[PDB]
Structure 1
Amino acid sequence: PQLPEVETIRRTLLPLIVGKTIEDVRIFWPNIIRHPRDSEAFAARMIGQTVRGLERRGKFLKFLLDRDALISHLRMEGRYAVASALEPLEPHTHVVFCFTDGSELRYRDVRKFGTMHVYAKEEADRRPPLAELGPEPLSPAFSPAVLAERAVKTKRSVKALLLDCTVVAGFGNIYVDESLFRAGILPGRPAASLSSKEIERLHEEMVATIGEAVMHLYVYGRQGNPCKRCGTPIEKTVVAGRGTHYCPRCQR
């Protein structure tokens, strides 16, 4: 799921778990557990705590308990569901939080790429994976000035810059390609080569693209198909080690 989907999850999941008390934590793929390193310590500390809130930072979910916060990233295919302890688990269920009311919060992930970290609430923001996380793309903290500052000081491509979680929080590949198309900028352009005009335009399109989503595609996954603005075939290459889609006419 991308940032807008994660926000939807935050909003919809909260009422399904708020006020419930953890009675057990069951782990079927311990590699998902990143802190404490020991999955047994992760499980033990959460028992007895009540879910008090659910926040999002970038594509991370932050479950707020009594003493601890659980920081969860779903990566490509992670998913949460709340269901009865009486029913069989769905395939690829790797972590289950069992509540005292006989319900469960289940984490599924066919790819097993997702991660979980638990720390005392007051430590969460200063430890991985939230430490160093850049500003929310929809916040005043993410501004053209901030983007400009990062762009001038690097030798990387503009696409590489936008994918950097320290630059802006949770801006995914799809939205990078879409934003760059809408801003008229080739993804392989060195970030430092962007004019102040291009930086402003790019920031504008970034906010608009992800903002719209939180509330069709021009290039992403459309390689070989005509551009919706000019009819030129969309092309796909590799930039910043990722599948990259662009129109060679609209983008410069």
Structure 2
Amino acid sequence: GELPEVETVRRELEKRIVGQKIISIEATYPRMVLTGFEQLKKELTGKTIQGISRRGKYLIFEIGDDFRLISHLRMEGKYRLATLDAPREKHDHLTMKFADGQLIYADVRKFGTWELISTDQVLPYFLKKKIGPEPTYEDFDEKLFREKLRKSTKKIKPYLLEQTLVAGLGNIYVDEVLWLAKIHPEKETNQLIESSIHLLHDSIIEILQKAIKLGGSSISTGKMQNELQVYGKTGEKCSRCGAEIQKIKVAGRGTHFCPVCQQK
């Protein structure tokens, strides 16, 4: 559930529920709704989906211009539109009923969260969570990026995973990015040379953008997993130097890299 995959879901839902009126909201795992499902039911029932935007890995349902629904898929949250009488599968937790169908949210690990936030609190929400700039040449200022990177001793992969220097990078794309920029995941940010930072900054925007267009690496119906150079390729040869991709643990996360291309 990284920015590429979340953006793919935003567009799918975008062209399938925007403008639809909500008839009622049923929940079998209500606590998932951190702000009180009851309060959410009383307020979104009988509304219209105005739009579905995204910020980092968070989906934002715009229902009426009073409240915004912040949705986060965590590790395996997943939406799907199905028949009104469709049967209830094992890990379905919420359903948004429409006049002609329903939006179902599933999540095996129950990690996912839902939040109803008044329109004016959207920005303070992300600013309170310290979410960095979207991965675009316009919002991802390289200088600020360089500045933050030389001021820290944090290891690169962990630090990128924080969403602070930039938003959207998860385990898959950080490994892809770091390899594409020839930076070892344990390299301390304050040692990075500008040319490295510059290459990193660009590889970030580049790979996340490439992923968006390939529909994300949905192991839905995405094709980015077909172009992964190191994530999960443990034991396979490096696209460039041919060395065997190694897998190690960094800050508790499976980390794939190349011993040679990624020096550090």
TM-score of the pair, normalised by structure 1? 0.93
Q: Matches of 2:82 and 2:128 in 1, distance apart?
A: 29
Secondary structure (helix, strand or coil) at the match of 1:85 reads: coil
Matches within 5 A, 1:83-162: 83-99=82-98, 101-127=99-125, 131-162=129-160
Q: Does 1:236 align with 2:240?
A: no
Unaligned runs of 5+ in 1: none
Other-structure match for 1:218:
229
Q: Does 1:183 align with 2:181?
A: yes
Q: Matches of 2:134 and 2:43 in 1, distance apart?
A: 30
Q: Matches of 1:128 and 1:11 in 2, distance apart?
A: 21
1:6 offset after TM fit, Å? 1.4
Other-structure match for 1:74:
73
Q: Matches of 1:147 and 1:182 in 2, distance apart?
A: 18
Q: Matches of 2:189 and 2:83 in 1, distance apart?
A: 50
Matches within 5 A, 1:162-201: 162-201=160-199
Secondary structure (helix, strand or coil) at the match of 2:163 reads: coil
Q: Matches of 1:20 and 1:129 in 2, distance apart?
A: 30
Secondary structure (helix, strand or coil) at the match of 1:125 reads: helix
Question: What do residues 27-60 of structure 1 show as CA deviations (whole Å, max 9, x unaligned)?
Answer: 11123111x2x22112222112211000011111
| Aligned amino acid, residue 4 of structure 1 | P
| Aligned amino acid, residue 3 of structure 2 | L
Unaligned runs of 5+ in 2: 214-226
Q: Matches of 2:208 and 2:148 in 1, distance apart?
A: 20
- Once superposed, which parts of structure 1, at least 4 consecutive aligned residues long, lie more than 3 Å away? 128-131
| Aligned amino acid, residue 200 of structure 1 | H
Q: Matches of 2:168 and 2:30 in 1, distance apart?
A: 25
Question: What do residues 49-83 of structure 1 show as CA deviations (whole Å, max 9, x unaligned)?
Answer: 21100001111110001121101111121111122
| Aligned amino acid, residue 148 of structure 1 | R
Q: Matches of 1:59 and 1:203 in 2, distance apart?
A: 18
Matches within 5 A, 1:199-210: 199-210=197-208
Other-structure match for 2:25:
25
Question: What do residues 105-142 of structure 1 show as CA deviations (whole Å, max 9, x unaligned)?
Answer: 11011111111111111212212697421110125111
Secondary structure (helix, strand or coil) at the match of 2:95 reads: strand
Number of aligned residue pairs: give it: 249
Q: Which has the larger displacement, 108-117 or 130-139? A: 130-139
1:19 offset after TM fit, Å? 1.7
Other-structure match for 1:62:
60
Q: Matches of 2:148 and 2:253 in 1, distance apart?
A: 21
Q: Matches of 1:130 and 1:16 in 2, distance apart?
A: 31
Contact residue 137 and residue 205 of structure 2 kept, 8 A: no
Other-structure match for 2:216:
none
Q: Matches of 1:223 and 1:129 in 2, distance apart?
A: 37
Contact residue 3 and residue 59 of structure 1 kept, 8 A: yes
Contact residue 125 and residue 131 of structure 1 kept, 8 A: no
Q: Matches of 1:129 and 1:152 in 2, distance apart?
A: 23
Q: Matches of 1:148 and 1:184 in 2, distance apart?
A: 17
Q: Matches of 1:25 and 1:182 in 2, distance apart?
A: 44
Q: Matches of 1:90 and 1:137 in 2, distance apart?
A: 36
